[PDB]
Design a protein around this ligand. Sequence first.
Ligand SMILES: [Zn+2]
Ligand SMILES: [Zn+2]
Lengths: 115, 215, 392, 57, 256, 228
Amino acid sequence: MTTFRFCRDCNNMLYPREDKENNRLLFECRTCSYVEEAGSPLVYRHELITNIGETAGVVQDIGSDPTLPRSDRECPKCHSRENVFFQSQQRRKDTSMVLFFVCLSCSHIFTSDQK
Amino acid sequence: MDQENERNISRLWRAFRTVKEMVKDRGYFITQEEVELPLEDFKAKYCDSMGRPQRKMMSFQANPTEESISKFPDMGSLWVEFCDEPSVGVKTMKTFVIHIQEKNFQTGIFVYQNNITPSAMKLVPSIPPATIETFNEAALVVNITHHELVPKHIRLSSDEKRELLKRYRLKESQLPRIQRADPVALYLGLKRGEVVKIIRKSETSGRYASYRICM
Amino acid sequence: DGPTMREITETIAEAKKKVLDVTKEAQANLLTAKHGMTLRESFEDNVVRFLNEARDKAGRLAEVNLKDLNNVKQMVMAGSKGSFINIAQMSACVGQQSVEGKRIAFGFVDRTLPHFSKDDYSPESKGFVENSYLRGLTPQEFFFHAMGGREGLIDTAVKTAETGYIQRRLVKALEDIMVHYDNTTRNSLGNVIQFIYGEDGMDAAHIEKQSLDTIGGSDAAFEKRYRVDLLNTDHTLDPSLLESGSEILGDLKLQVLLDEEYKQLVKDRKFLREVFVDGEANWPLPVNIRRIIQNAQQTFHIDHTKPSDLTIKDIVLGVKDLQENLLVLRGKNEIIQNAQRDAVTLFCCLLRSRLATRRVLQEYRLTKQAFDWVLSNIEAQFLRSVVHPGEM
Amino acid sequence: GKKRLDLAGPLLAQLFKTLFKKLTKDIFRYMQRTVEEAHDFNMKLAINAKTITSGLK
Amino acid sequence: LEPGHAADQEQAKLIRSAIEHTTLKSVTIASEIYYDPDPRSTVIPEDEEIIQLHFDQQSPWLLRLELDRAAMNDKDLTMGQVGERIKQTFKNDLFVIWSEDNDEKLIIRCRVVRDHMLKKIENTMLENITLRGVENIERVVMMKYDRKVPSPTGEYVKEPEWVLETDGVNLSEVMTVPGIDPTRIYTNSFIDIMEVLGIEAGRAALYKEVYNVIASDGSYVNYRHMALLVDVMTTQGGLTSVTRHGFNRSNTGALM
Amino acid sequence: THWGLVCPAETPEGQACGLVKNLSLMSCISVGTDPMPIITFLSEWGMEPLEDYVPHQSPDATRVFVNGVWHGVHRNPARLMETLRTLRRKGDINPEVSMIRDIREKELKIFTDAGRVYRPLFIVEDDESLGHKELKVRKGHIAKLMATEYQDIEGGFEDVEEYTWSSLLNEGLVEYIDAEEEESILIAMQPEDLEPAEANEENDLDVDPAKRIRVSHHATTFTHCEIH
Ligand SMILES: [Zn+2]
Ligand SMILES: [Zn+2]
């Protein structure tokens, strides 16, 4: 799940296989017959829910947008009195209403989760 | 493990109580004592020391001569036999049919556990004039007659039906109809052409009587 | 006046402060969601409840402030036109504009209008109107009101068509149902749908809402109001009530009649309790006994002090004759007789409740002629209230 | 912001496009018919002009 | 609920165990397919202690569910019960290892002894399987309602009682659940009532629904009209919808 | 999104309710413009073509869309947006050309087709003389407009050379905003909202009790103002 394995030779991807002979896990391109050591204890992973720490893309020049409201919360890092905040950008009916404050200076993200 | 056995025992006891109540309501002779049989007594009698539910609960009900025989001089004896097999087979139902025929029982009630075989259902309507009725334990766990939304159903004899038709001047088709597969019809064992009487309570009159024909 | 507007403004400000506190609590994830609802649905429900309560309180204050000489108040009190909500919206505050039951949705990206800021959940930005019609509306609440009116117009336009289609189908599906001369409801094919119209055979236009005293009340009150005993202490009949006082004591026929009447009354009470689980006593019934007895009392000039000329035996026999004289089916066989007997059970219960011996000799005191007139009027009204065969 | 309004612009453009295509088809059919004998321009043009005027009206 | 345990809050809390708790979907957070050629040992040390204390017998592929602390809340924690239900729904060689329900996070591991087939068994264990409750039921809401019951003195009084509202409709087996009152159960869907109660009960439920619809706004309609409508629509053994396929498919006159 | 484009009250009753809409006052519809000059301007100012573009090694790139067609990416959307706005306000680009930038989505869409509905709006720019944002239109421009309006009745000798609405558009005081571009701007209802940050707040003041209450302000980054 960390990264889909791609063959160094050619450009295809490496499905996974078992080296029981050496009782090991080896990823195989099975097109050009390229096999490496393939050292990883994870094969597949599925995530049922979505976390809250994803915030947003937080692209630079976020302060250039005038539609984002401004607040006066103190930044934990630089102790500034100016910042912008927005709700979580995950679009579902179960997401909470926690605000993600973004510091225009020092490029810091701090949430309002006082739980 | 033990909780599943206890739940199955309780469900079997409730089904047995419902079967006894249905037999009593159909017009046969069942004392009120055996109807409210305690769970402890049921476990002591119909269950062995190991704890597995033994389906030895076979009873033969006879029609009382006080009212049942007088109203319907054609009712004989009833044979209700529970089955130990989880899913019944064609051969087992053949032995059941032979057992019913040997002592010429007028009607017999068979209760399965999970599902019924279509092959056995094909031969279900055989061996006339004896009628074979099939029931499910899950459907018989609770009694639907005791529900507050289900009014009282009273069967009508041939003379009563003829008198009603003559008095109201109606044909057989000019009556409300109830399906033969209706749960109340199965509970009462209604046959084709049988007229049932329904007594309900209304907000305009104290009592109201309605008649339906099993068609 | 000034103080009333100040109080309304204070109430609105308090509601806005409460909404702001709720929003602040929710934004910190300290809010607890009601079971079966998400963290947003409960918050929205709380917000709309607070806003509606504030609007109702402001409207009630404005209505209270209005004097008795107010023309709108006079129109509302008379009931000719207007209501409390109209006065509230015209004088104190216009209610929050809503779409399909919810607040104004975010038409833009997390915004309702371009003039607001992103992720704004304040009541003003979500479609809550603070001003009244007299004061005037800002452009935002004007737009919200326009959206609400558009929704209303669309709802009316769709509803009229759907209701027309439903009405046409219902009329076409029940156009052949008639009541025949045998008091049975049948279709064109002759199939019987109802063995008696309305399960009682009574015309709808000849039914009035009446209360049954037997079902209601406590056991002690019921016994005090109904039980009458002669050869015993307590619940005794006052001799001055009737001219035959101080002489009916020691009689056996009167005592057995009284106790059998009490047994019938208690059986009727049990039957009514079984029929009506909720205990409701006000039910529509054909003939209004109370109006008849009041008319008889007014037209006969009862002295309410002189002893009555009625007798217990005469009253009981008259009640039984009246009960037997109510015919709805008029049949001779057993089935029709049983149907007629059990199709007037509720009316018999009401008649027994309203014509008890204690009630007649204590509250509604009538003479022999007045009692006969009451019985004849009851019988005539019941006979005239029966449904007419041939009705659609 | 994702919807467009059609004034008396592209509607007349579509009408004129269809009618001009009919014009071209008619003139091409006449040219194909006349390759055997001779050529001239103002016989199919007039009839197809009546067609385009009638269609627009 | 039962008349005896009407105001019993503990009985009400025990009730609502009939809600369908989906398998490893509303309780778990993540799923792992950690590969381990060693049937006994494991690469990570998180569960080495539980493996040590716990101890065709080799499972090269291993499952792992992260679960969540919400298992203790709402429904019972029952760390062993979930794995026991998985075992009794799988059996065969689906050897699983339980957690100790005290080492902070709750981890349940599944192993199969004989990767494409692994996905199929994971899908079966995740999509179509139930632990406890009644199927076709999603949300159950508990609320308190006031019911009028006569007092021992003979007077009607308002007695509060607990009432459960269920989003789903599975009355066929809901009525058989112990601890509830089967003679007072009601469903706004009259379609399912007749198949379990009868035609008359279905007619009564249909009349109740019609009355509720009519009286919602506040208007009053005489009982005779609604009674006639419900009797006409249920003259036969089942519902006769007022449509083309309903009343218009009878033995009446062709012209009509 | 119908604010300022269609009448919220004018609609027929019946089956056509909501389907027939009447254009509001001060509402216009674009006629169309070829996008080739826009493409040339984008290429001249620095804009990598889509052909020689790799998603990796260029994570922070804003896609550029012209009439719904992807043409390439830009490494600094803010500078290009400012240049395009300056060109449009100077009259070099057609005033009816929509230009909307999505900072979060990393997209820059430019529309030059026909059928779009737009309305004029005031332009608010920060002024260092007053220390706060103020309307670009001034009393001098207002006086010139009134002089033009009065002159045409008489035989005026081109006192201000017919200072008309086109002059306002070309000077940069009023610009056209469509529905799509309305999602990236902040609009003040009235010029009274463009007061200093304090705006006489946190101080007790007396106002007319019968006057309609208004919240107003609650912002300091206004980019446009409603004409009326
Ligand atoms: Zn390769
Ligand atoms: Zn900072």
